[PDB]
Amino acid sequence: QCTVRYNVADCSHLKLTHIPDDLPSNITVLNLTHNQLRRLPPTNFTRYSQLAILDAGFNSISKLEPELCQILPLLKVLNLQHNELSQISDQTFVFCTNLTELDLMSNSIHKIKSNPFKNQKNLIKLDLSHNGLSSTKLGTGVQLENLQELLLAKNKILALRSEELEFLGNSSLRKLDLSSNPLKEFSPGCFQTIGKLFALLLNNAQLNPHLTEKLCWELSNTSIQNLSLANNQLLATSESTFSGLKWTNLTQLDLSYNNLHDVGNGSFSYLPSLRYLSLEYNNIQRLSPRSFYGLSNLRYLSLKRAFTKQSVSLASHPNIDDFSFQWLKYLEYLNMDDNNIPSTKSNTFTGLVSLKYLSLSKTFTSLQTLTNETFVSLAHSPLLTLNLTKNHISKIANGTFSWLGQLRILDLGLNEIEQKLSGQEWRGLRNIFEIYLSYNKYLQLSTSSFALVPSLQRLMLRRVALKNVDISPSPFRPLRNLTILDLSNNNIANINEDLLEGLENLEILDFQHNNLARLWVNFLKGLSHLHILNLESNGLDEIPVGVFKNLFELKSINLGLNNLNKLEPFIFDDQTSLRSLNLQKNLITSVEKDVFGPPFQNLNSLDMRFNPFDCTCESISWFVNWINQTHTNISELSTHYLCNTPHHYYGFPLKLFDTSSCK
Ligand SMILES: *[C@H]1O[C@H](CO)[C@@H](O[C@H]2O[C@H](CO)[C@@H](O[C@H]3O[C@H](CO[C@H]4O[C@H](CO)[C@@H](O)[C@H](O)[C@@H]4O)[C@@H](O)[C@H](O[C@@H]4O[C@H](CO)[C@@H](O)[C@H](O)[C@@H]4O)[C@@H]3O)[C@H](O)[C@H]2NC(C)=O)[C@H](O)[C@H]1NC(C)=O
Ligand SMILES: *[C@H]1O[C@H](CO[C@H]2O[C@@H](C)[C@@H](O)[C@@H](O)[C@@H]2O)[C@@H](O[C@H]2O[C@H](CO)[C@@H](O[C@@H]3O[C@H](CO)[C@@H](O)[C@H](O)[C@@H]3O)[C@H](O)[C@H]2NC(C)=O)[C@H](O)[C@H]1NC(C)=O
Ligand SMILES: *[C@@H]1O[C@H](CO[C@H]2O[C@@H](C)[C@@H](O)[C@@H](O)[C@@H]2O)[C@@H](O[C@@H]2O[C@H](CO)[C@@H](O)[C@H](O)[C@H]2NC(C)=O)[C@H](O)[C@H]1NC(C)=O
Ligand SMILES: *[C@@H]1O[C@H](CO)[C@@H](O[C@@H]2O[C@H](CO)[C@@H](O)[C@H](O)[C@H]2NC(C)=O)[C@H](O)[C@H]1NC(C)=O
Ligand SMILES: *[C@@H]1O[C@H](CO)[C@@H](O[C@H]2O[C@H](CO)[C@@H](O)[C@H](O)[C@H]2NC(C)=O)[C@H](O)[C@H]1NC(C)=O
Ligand SMILES: *[C@@H]1O[C@H](CO)[C@@H](O[C@H]2O[C@H](CO)[C@@H](O)[C@H](O)[C@H]2NC(C)=O)[C@H](O)[C@H]1NC(C)=O
Ligand SMILES: *[C@H]1O[C@H](CO)[C@@H](O[C@@H]2O[C@H](CO)[C@@H](O)[C@H](O)[C@H]2NC(C)=O)[C@H](O)[C@H]1NC(C)=O
Ligand SMILES: *[C@@H]1O[C@H](CO)[C@@H](O)[C@H](O)[C@H]1NC(C)=O
Ligand SMILES: *[C@@H]1O[C@H](CO)[C@@H](O)[C@H](O)[C@H]1NC(C)=O
Ligand SMILES: *[C@@H]1O[C@H](CO)[C@@H](O)[C@H](O)[C@H]1NC(C)=O
Ligand SMILES: *[C@H]1O[C@H](CO)[C@@H](O)[C@H](O)[C@H]1NC(C)=O
Ligand SMILES: C[C@@H]1O[C@@H](O)[C@@H](O)[C@H](O)[C@@H]1O
């Protein structure tokens, strides 16, 4: 039966057929979702006349009794989605007044007569989607004074009369949704009849260029701001297409998923108030210097997947030409992901003088080499972020970035870079904060590799194969303010121990899968801000005393997947703030207190399973006792902590080891 938390009585997937009484009378909620109820007799609700929100979505309800509302005088949100209600009457919701949200989302209510919501002078959001409606008309007089969000998507409405919307004579609508209706015409004045219209959703309504043109006329001279037209048949645009919007202060426009092939010249010259524009998922063939004329106030532009695709046969690629964005002088964000553009041009980005975030992931096809001229079109953009993942880049040249003097994030991962870093690629990055090089072919380092980027703070070199790493002074030496150094899966041939000297601000160090055992001293020298340290998978099997001396800030240490067994007492003497310890899949035999006491003191989480535990009081008594009385999190205790010796204890669960009989 029903479970009852704070003031709410949840009875969701039980397959009920009756309304339960066991529940409190001090509840102001009641989730009867997803059951089997015939209907909701206006009498069985007395016990909880405190019901603030009755949620009976997804049942078999057929009719609603008028008395229900009055028997429940504090019903604010009623939900009857996906029920079986037939037709609403003039007398049904006649009592519900404190109502703020009514949802009749899925009841196949084909027709509406009279004024069924005359008294809902408080209803803030009405939902009548997915029925059989063929008219927007819900009344005869100016009613629903306070309505704010009318949802009527997924119906069968073919026309917007001026007559069938006047009941909103003075209703400040924030959102009218008519998505998924087969609109064949918009009569004159249809959208004017509303008090105020702010946001309109006409997705997936089968609109084409002409009907969209007549749509924008009917929108002239209304307070609309968000207009969404995604997923229609708007194959091309003219200057006349959006002209009717010059008489509006439109702000946001969605034009994705329309199969848009050709943006006419000046298709947007009457949108000087637009800030957000989406062109995602389309087939733009060309962008010319005239394409975005008029968008002098634009801020966010997404052209992700907005171009001509690959196609099965012909090698087709869009053609954006110099200056296409020369008018977007207030733009700060530009997403150009997932497209088949060949490369940049010496003036591709010119005019974007307020740009900050430029995304170019999986954007280019014919690049592969970056040169001193590739990004010259941004020499005048205050860029902070540059994404270049997935472009098949293989070489970066001297001075490539000298233009982006104000960059902070640089992302060159998932590429095929293959070269030696003389240090001159970064020439000019005065403010760079993070550089991402993970998932590349190979980088040959040098004494100067990062000499010109001292402001750096985060550097990732995962899965890259590093050459020339045992060189003094270390290649990481100039990075005094470095805080994250994630370089794993490189398997470095020789690691001189000078590495990492001077990284006083280092907080995270990732050195996994780098066969660190061979070269092995005292790696971690003065890294007293180290918090997270991962040395997983290095074939380690005899770790020195002193490598953790003075790392008082360690919160997690991961030495899993090595060959550790014998540990010198006091190694973890300084790790008393440790929250997490993982030595899983090692060769540990004993778990003594002179080694594991300190760290265990405050540990929130421990992972030490898959180890040849020796079941003898000398090896585990202290351990097994500690395990019984600690609040620490140990997972899979009962099954993945088994004893290995002696004979009689092969595979016996550690936690079951009797300790009483010990001394
Ligand atoms: C510039 O542009 C790049 C391209 O869009 C963008 O790349 C990525 O952006 C984010 C940030 O990493 C990724 O978001 C998520 O997916 C990543 C991998 O998750 C995997 O697993 C989930 C779960 O099954 C799948 O849904 C998913 O498809 C994938 O298989 C990953 O980044 C992240 O997941 C993980 O989070 C953990 C947090 O505790 C990590 O340990 C773990 O290592 C992993 O990061 C996240 O959920 C995008 O997937 C990725 N974009 C794509 C589509 O390739 C760059 O971030 C952006 N560059 C920057 C840094 O500005
Ligand atoms: C760019 O990348 C490398 C660095 O060049 C930069 O050095 C700065 C100190 C600064 O003066 C910048 O103006 C300059 O661009 C450079 O590396 C190779 O070429 C260097 C010549 O600049 C080589 O230096 C050596 O210099 C001695 C001096 O006489 C000379 O005899 C010797 O032959 C050699 O040239 C350096 O050894 C080179 N590094 C290696 C081995 O790769 C790149 O050439 C520059 N890129 C290009 C091709 O433009
Ligand atoms: C589009 O242009 C302006 C937008 O400016 C108005 O926007 C309002 C939402 C409000 O927050 C404020 O920014 C400003 O009132 C509208 O012009 C305004 O119209 C009102 C009433 O007619 C006047 O009293 C204002 O003075 C006037 N601003 C100016 C300086 O002309 C304009 O009405 C609007 N057009 C449409 C079709 O909505
Ligand atoms: C948009 O306008 C530009 C000019 O700003 C057009 O440029 C020329 O258009 C004519 C007519 O097709 C042809 O000469 C060339 O296609 C273009 N050459 C020159 C001189 O620039 C451009 O073609 C127009 N493109 C559209 C309709 O998207
Ligand atoms: C129009 O566009 C979006 C709706 O998703 C909203 O625009 C912006 O401001 C909102 C705050 O009112 C934020 O919640 C949005 O995240 C933000 N948009 C961006 C770029 O992410 C705005 O609410 C919408 N107007 C409506 C629906 O009335
Ligand atoms: C990249 O570096 C500069 C920046 O554009 C280019 O121009 C300089 O080098 C040229 C030799 O190729 C000289 O002819 C130019 O005069 C010189 N700039 C000056 C000082 O006026 C250079 O060509 C580019 N080199 C490459 C391709 O890496
Ligand atoms: C690395 O970190 C230090 C933080 O102390 C940076 O110094 C700061 O920034 C400027 C120097 O450009 C100083 O005038 C400020 O007083 C410092 N405080 C901060 C954080 O605002 C130092 O510059 C950084 N390394 C670089 C980029 O050289
Ligand atoms: C309402 O209460 C009466 C009490 O006799 C009960 O018989 C009836 O089944 C209840 N209604 C339903 C079907 O929930
Ligand atoms: C909107 O509210 C009522 C509708 O019943 C109307 O009489 C009134 O004139 C309108 N608001 C104004 C302008 O007073
Ligand atoms: C691990 O589980 C125990 C449950 O007894 C919990 O009390 C402890 O807080 C958990 N560890 C964490 C998340 O700190
Ligand atoms: C746990 O084991 C200890 C011995 O270390 C014993 O005293 C205690 O009763 C046990 N309690 C359980 C079953 O958790
Ligand atoms: C070459 C083109 O010529 C006209 O069409 C101008 O209106 C454009 O701005 C462009 O300069």
From Swiss-Prot:
Homology family: Belongs to the Toll-like receptor family.
Organism: Mus musculus
Keywords: Disulfide bond, Endoplasmic reticulum, Endosome, Glycoprotein, Immunity, Inflammatory response, Innate immunity, Isopeptide bond, Leucine-rich repeat, Membrane, Phosphoprotein, Receptor, Repeat, RNA-binding, Signal, Transmembrane, Transmembrane helix, Ubl conjugation
Written domain comment of the UniProt record: ds-RNA binding is mediated by LRR 1 to 3, and LRR 17 to 18.
All copies of domain LRRNT, residue ranges: 1-25
Domain LRRCT: 611-663
Post-translational modification: TLR3 signaling requires a proteolytic cleavage mediated by cathepsins CTSB and CTSH, the cleavage occurs between amino acids 252 and 346. The cleaved form of TLR3 is the predominant form found in endosomes. Ubiquitinated by TRIM3; leading to recognition and sorting of polyubiquitinated TLR3 by the ESCRT complexes. Ubiquitinated by ZNRF1 via 'Lys-63'-linked ubiquitin chains; leading to TLR3 lysosomal trafficking and degradation.
Entry comment describing in which tissues the protein is expressed: Highly expressed in lung. After intraperitoneal injection of lipopolysaccharide, highly expressed in brain, heart, kidney, liver, lung and spleen.
GO BP: cellular response to exogenous dsRNA; cellular response to interferon-beta; cellular response to mechanical stimulus; cellular response to type II interferon; cellular response to virus; cellular response to xenobiotic stimulus; defense response; defense response to virus
Taxonomic superkingdom: Eukaryota
LRR repeat spans: 26-47, 50-71, 74-95, 98-119, 122-143, 146-169, 172-193, 223-244, 249-270, 273-294, 297-318, 330-351, 354-374, 382-403, 406-427, 431-452, 455-475, 481-502, 505-520, 529-550, 553-574, 577-598
Record: glycosylation sites: 26, 31, 44, 98, 170, 221, 226, 249, 265, 372, 387, 398, 481, 628, 633
UniProt subunit comment: Monomer and homodimer; dimerization is triggered by ligand-binding, the signaling unit is composed of one ds-RNA of around 40 bp and two TLR3 molecules, and lateral clustering of signaling units along the length of the ds-RNA ligand is required for TLR3 signal transduction. Interacts (via transmembrane domain) with UNC93B1; the interaction is required for transport from the ER to the endosomes. Interacts with SRC; upon binding of double-stranded RNA. Interacts with TICAM1 (via the TIR domain) in response to poly(I:C) and this interaction is enhanced in the presence of WDFY1.
The protein, known as: Toll-like receptor 3
Lumenal-side segments: 1-663
GO cellular component: cell surface; early endosome; endoplasmic reticulum membrane; endosome membrane; plasma membrane
Described function: Key component of innate and adaptive immunity. TLRs (Toll-like receptors) control host immune response against pathogens through recognition of molecular patterns specific to microorganisms. TLR3 is a nucleotide-sensing TLR which is activated by double-stranded RNA, a sign of viral infection. Acts via the adapter TRIF/TICAM1, leading to NF-kappa-B activation, IRF3 nuclear translocation, cytokine secretion and the inflammatory response.
Keyword Transmembrane: yes
Location of the protein in the cell: Endoplasmic reticulum membrane; Endosome membrane; Early endosome
Membrane topology: Single-pass type I membrane protein
Gene: Tlr3
GO MF, any single term: transmembrane signaling receptor activity
Disulfide bonds: 2-11, 69-96, 615-643, 617-662
Stretch of the intact protein here: 28 to 698 of 905
